[PDB]
Amino acid sequence: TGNIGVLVSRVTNPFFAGLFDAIERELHAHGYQVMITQTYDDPEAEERFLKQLKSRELDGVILASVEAPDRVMAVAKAFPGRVVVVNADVQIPGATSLVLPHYQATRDALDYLFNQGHRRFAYVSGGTISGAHHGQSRTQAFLDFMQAHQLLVAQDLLFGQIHTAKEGQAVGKQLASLAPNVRPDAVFTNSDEVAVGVIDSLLAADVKVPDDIAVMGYDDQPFAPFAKIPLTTVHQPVASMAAAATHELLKGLGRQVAQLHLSLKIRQSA
């Protein structure tokens, strides 16, 4: 039982830190040493990481972020059993791949919001909304939801490449600046980090959350229940997906014998 690598976009995303920790504690119990690398969505960083498996510095890898599916596929095909993909919204031929139903969860969270009476929506993504991006199952869910309710998408309430709390503060400060009649009723943040920042800037401006603007998180990160306005959010089953990924890897490695729900978490912010 040797070295395993985990690949994520950003370790300071508490979702990824928590996924890594759950994977690492189980793999460690099985005798492996686990290391994490972050890409910041750079395909070159993904390539470089995969060279560690190609050169057999690692026995196996778990990818929780994917930039170049075709590159990952070629590695997986060359290293059968040694590449596992988890929660990257992609199935990679040659790699056991776990996909969670983010389109469904996003539609369900948006329906929740519509059912509370919200009609003017702001939508935030970590990707560039106009092109292919991380989180596009969610962007499609958003567009399908708006179409299903014949709601006009306001382009001025779409925010792309927003990842951190500090970026969310800037979004929230802009939304708080808006006249009541053009301000959104609700913000779909795609991230609890972003949500905390959005909410902080709204409250700084005496904008009421949720009464003036409801804020929907994503992930149910550790701080979510502890936030100033405890976050309503989409809960990802971090421990369960970690256990699943870990088992798939250990099975592929020949270590283990053969033998995941998103949920809406309602608190105060929406």
Q: Does 219 bind ligand GLC (CB under 6 A)?
A: yes
Alpha-carbon span 223 to 36, nearest angstrom: 22
Comparing CB distances to a second copy, the nearer of 72 and 194 is 194
Contact positions with ligand GLC (CB under 6 A) in 83-122 = 87
The residue type of 221 is: Q
Binding partner at 36 among ligand GLC, a second copy, none, C-beta below 5 to 8 Å by kind: a second copy
Alpha-carbon span 190 to 207, nearest angstrom: 21
Closest CA to 238 of 3, 16, 11: 16
Binding partner at 112 among a second copy, ligand GLC, none, C-beta below 5 to 8 Å by kind: none
3-class secondary-structure state, position 18 = helix
Closest CA to 16 of 267, 193, 138, 171: 193
Q: Does 17 bind a second copy (CB under 8 A)?
A: yes
3-class secondary-structure state, position 62 = strand
Q: Does 228 bind a second copy (CB under 8 A)?
A: yes
User: Phi first, then psi: what are they for 188, rounded to 5°?
Assistant: -95, 105
Comparing CB distances to a second copy, the nearer of 11 and 78 is 11
CB of 136 to a second copy, least distance (A): 25
Contact positions with a second copy (CB under 8 A) in 159-218 = 165, 196-197, 200
* Tokens describing residue 175: 């939304």
Which span (23-31, 80-88, 125-133, 179-187) binds a second copy, by CB under 8 A?
Answer: 23-31
Alpha-carbon span 111 to 172, nearest angstrom: 22
Q: Does 13 bind ligand GLC (CB under 6 A)?
A: yes
User: Phi first, then psi: what are they for 162, rounded to 5°?
Assistant: -110, 115
Cβ atoms < 10 Å from Cβ of 20: 22
Q: Does 41 bind a second copy (CB under 8 A)?
A: no
Comparing CB distances to a second copy, the nearer of 51 and 149 is 51
Comparing CB distances to a second copy, the nearer of 119 and 228 is 228
Alpha-carbon span 7 to 92, nearest angstrom: 15
CB of 222 to a second copy, least distance (A): 6
* Tokens describing residue 54: 């190609």
By Cβ distance, which residue is nearest to ligand GLC?
Answer: 191
Gyration radius from the chain CA atoms:
19
- Contacting residues toward ligand GLC, per CB under 6 A: 13, 15, 65, 87, 126, 134-135, 191, 218-219
- Contacting residues toward a second copy, per CB under 8 A: 5, 10-12, 14, 17-18, 20-21, 24-25, 28, 33-38, 40, 45, 48-49, 57, 165, 196-197, 200, 222-223, 225-228
